[PDB]
Design a binder for these strands. Structure first.
Ligand SMILES: [Zn+2]
Lengths: 154, 78, 99, 60, 112, 128
RNA sequence: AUUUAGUUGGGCACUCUAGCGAGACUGCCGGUGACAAACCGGAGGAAGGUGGGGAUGACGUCAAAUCAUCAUGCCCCUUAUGACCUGGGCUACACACGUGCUACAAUGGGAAGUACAACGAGUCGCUAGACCGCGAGGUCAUGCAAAUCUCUUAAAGCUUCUCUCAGUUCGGAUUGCAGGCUGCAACUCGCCUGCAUGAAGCCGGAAUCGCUAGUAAUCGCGGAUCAGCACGCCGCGGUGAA
């Protein structure tokens, strides 16, 4: 915080596919100390995904991910005390963080009255580069290098 | 909420039955804040105390349900 | 057998030494004594706002505890019975002879 | 006025729903521990003086 | 028009739709249907012409009408025209217990 | 006869594990392990001791339990297993420690404090 | 071994209860360091580097607060500003603000089955059990001044079915009627139940608050004052993130 960086609390793998990413995604759906429900919508969404175009709940998942995880980011810094936003070389981990964040959040507004159809359709559309999360990453990369001229030698 | 019968204080009953023979005297001063209304009261004229002044009010028929305190309001707003 | 004694005080030293005394008065004459059985030690709680007019932030909470013991005996001879009847000390902890 | 009031309670009340609690040495009307019959502050202080058997400070 | 006084919807579930009519809550519908011996049927109601008459008969044994309001109206009328503090504050809306009104208008008038 | 024991504690819950040679099984309070447990597939959690020693069968488990929630005591059986396997061979404890799962998690609910709505929550507070 | 059961035999092994002890001290390893203090990593160990938490508040600042807990100089009332009783206030409502609770639903609404804590209260009080009324409850009776008996099988949880995106079966403010409890007495001015009616309200600007872990978020339990009345306050525990 002020002294120095701090530890990071790694998670356990999943009890079905044994994936650190799967657990790290189940956690980012839970709301208010209620977990089992999140696991249930995860598994049901996974089965729905594998149903139409059965390849894997994991492989198409990573496809959608690499479609999303960005490579730059505007980092507002007042080196000149002004509204300088300098493109930053985003770290490895925060990339996955933002992947999951955009996925879940922006999928929450997809709008299937059904419980988990929202997620499944979202990642299936992302793996094929259709959907605003893909547009979100491309917008981040289009605002980065939109001003890399005066914000790079820093 | 008193299903073991209603209630009116005795220093009003004896003072309201005492007219059942003849005509009624226009005045029955009281405290007038703990008594519901019984059928034996119709046609009287009871003044009602509001902590400040007694309020003279007659007795009609349908005005028989509630307690005595719902006619001299102690608020006086306006 | 047909006799036992409860203890309820605050400082454990007095309770424990009363325990030792009664065990002497029991296993002296006869035998078949039971040890100083511990017990759950009920506890209380209060909360006093540590001010006098305002500032309901500053709380000051107090407490109370009641250690307990328990001892039964078997085959009480007339000797130790009357020794119990005569033993009264200490006088900081309340005991009660009970069947 | 505390003297007329204190004298009030020592009598048997006019009706049963009238016998409330009030400290003995002091005379606070509110918040008297009806296990001790002390007010809030008087018990607070007297605890310091080592004159209530039992009560101490509670750290845990 | 439609089936009981007025106000019955189409393409719904039965027991829910029977609550719609003014004066029928939820217990009323279940007990009424009990006295016929029916069920949901189903989510688009497909009643038979005989069941309709059965319910039209069992309903006409209830004070609930498109007229329940007249009784309530006359009751608050008897109220407001004798004393009446309850009736007086019923010219301005206060209950059987009062609630120390310095917010209790946000449900009656939109005071702000 | 031969019987093996070991205890476990988590979040103020405690389970009294009992081990014996079998096929790989556990009867929680005379019930199948999938009864006491809800839906919970935190069963890899429970067999996780086995996934490192005596991999991954096969003994049986008698188990009593009381206290805490389900997740608490569920995690609290995990440690009777560790202690039992420890009873068998004191040649295993190194590979247990390196993989951990041997020391008692002392995290527990916090002693609250007067003046704060929760263990640390501070009430919203008007500035001016 | 046997019974409905740890009950009853049998036992004190375990669990737990609670006294006395034991244990964490940079104690040993490597390194950095002027060889010092200290610092980075290691073994062992349940915990490693003030292990986690609390109680504990220096000189003084602010003529901060308090003669209404109590005390007290001075000034004052004294057939009245002292005192007794009934009735009403402190609960008043065009309005402005601070703190909280319930919500705007599909991780949801309803219906049916299914398990798991912890802290404490109890003699004029906790009610067992059974009977009655759909309910708040009533009737007769049962133990308990206590690890025995009761409050009290905790609720979210887990398993099925129905409801389909609507001011909706969401929301239940408000109001009519009939009841229950304590109470000498519930209009002013109690808590709760049943029926009936069914408001605003579909995530909230400028602005602004809390929070670094068993925390935040969320769900229940208890008790202080107390015939009676808690969304407040004081404690406990369950689930469990970034
Ligand atoms: Zn006092």
């Amino acid at each position: 915080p002020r002294k120095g960086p701090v530890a990071k609390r790694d998670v356990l793998p999943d009890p079905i596919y044994n994936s650190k990413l799967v657990t790290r995604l189940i956690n980012r759906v839970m709301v208010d100390g209620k977990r089992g429900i999140a696991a249930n919508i995860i598994y049901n969404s996974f089965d729905i995904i594998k149903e139409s175009t059965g390849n894997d709940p994991l492989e198409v998942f990573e496809q959608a991910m690499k479609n999303v995880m960005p490579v730059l980011e505007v980092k507002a810094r007042r080196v000149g005390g002004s509204n300088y936003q300098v493109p930053v070389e985003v770290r490895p981990e925060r990339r996955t963080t933002l992947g999951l964040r955009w996925v879940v959040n922006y999928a929450r507004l997809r709008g299937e009255h059904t419980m988990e159809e929202r997620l499944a359709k979202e990642i299936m559309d992302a793996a094929n580069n259709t959907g605003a999360s893909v547009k979100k990453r491309e917008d981040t990369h289009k605002m980065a290098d939109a001003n890399r001229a005066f914000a790079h030698y820093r | 909420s008193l299903k073991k019968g209603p209630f009116v204080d005795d220093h009003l009953m004896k003072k309201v039955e005492a007219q059942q023979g003849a005509e009624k005297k226009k005045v029955i001063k009281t405290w007038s804040r703990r008594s519901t209304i019984f059928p034996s009261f119709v046609g009287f004229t009871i003044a009602v105390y509001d902590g400040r002044k007694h309020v003279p009010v007659y007795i009609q028929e349908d005005m028989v349900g509630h307690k005595l305190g719902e006619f001299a309001p102690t608020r006086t707003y306006r | 057998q047909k006799i036992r004694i409860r203890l309820k005080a605050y400082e454990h030293r007095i309770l424990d030494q009363s325990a030792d005394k009664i065990v002497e008065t029991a296993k002296r004459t006869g035998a078949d004594v039971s040890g100083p059985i511990p017990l759950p030690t009920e506890r209380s709680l209060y909360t006093v706002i540590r001010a006098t007019h305002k500032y309901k932030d500053s709380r000051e909470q107090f407490e109370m505890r009641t250690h307990k013991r328990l001892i039964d005996i078997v085959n009480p001879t007339p000797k130790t019975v009357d020794a119990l009847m005569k033993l009264d000390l200490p006088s900081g902890v309340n005991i009660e002879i009970k069947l | 006025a505390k003297k007329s009031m204190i004298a009030k309670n020592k009598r048997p009340a006019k009706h049963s729903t009238q016998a409330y609690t009030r400290c003995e040495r002091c005379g606070r009307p509110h918040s008297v521990y009806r296990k001790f019959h002390l007010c809030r502050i008087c018990f607070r202080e007297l605890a310091y003086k080592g004159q209530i058997p039992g009560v101490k400070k509670a750290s845990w | 028009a439609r089936i009981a006084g007025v106000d019955i919807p189409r393409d719904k579930r039965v027991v829910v739709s029977l609550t719609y009519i003014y004066g029928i809550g939820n217990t009323t519908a279940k007990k009424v249907l009990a006295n016929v011996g029916v069920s949901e049927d189903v989510r688009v109601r497909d009643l038979t012409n005989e069941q309709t008459d059965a319910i039209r008969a069992e309903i006409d044994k209830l004070k609930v009408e498109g007229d329940l309001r007249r009784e309530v109206n006359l009751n608050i009328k008897r109220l407001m025209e004798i004393g009446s503090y309850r009736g007086i504050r019923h010219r301005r809306g206060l209950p059987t217990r009062g609630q120390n009104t310095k917010n209790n208008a946000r449900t009656r008038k939109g005071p702000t | 006869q031969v019987q093996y024991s070991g205890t476990g504690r988590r979040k103020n819950a405690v389970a009294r594990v009992r081990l014996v040679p079998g096929t790989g099984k556990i009867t929680v309070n005379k019930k199948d392990v999938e009864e006491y447990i809800p839906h919970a597939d935190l069963r890899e959690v429970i067999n996780q001791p086995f996934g490192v020693t005596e991999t991954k069968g096969a003994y049986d488990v008698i188990v009593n339990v009381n206290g805490g929630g389900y997740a608490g005591q569920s995690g609290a059986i995990r440690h009777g297993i560790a202690r039992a396997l420890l009873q068998v061979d004191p040649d295993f404890r190194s590979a247990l420690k390196r993989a951990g799962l041997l020391t008692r998690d002392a995290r527990m609910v916090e002693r609250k404090k007067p003046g704060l709505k929760k263990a640390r929550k501070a009430s919203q507070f008007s500035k001016r």
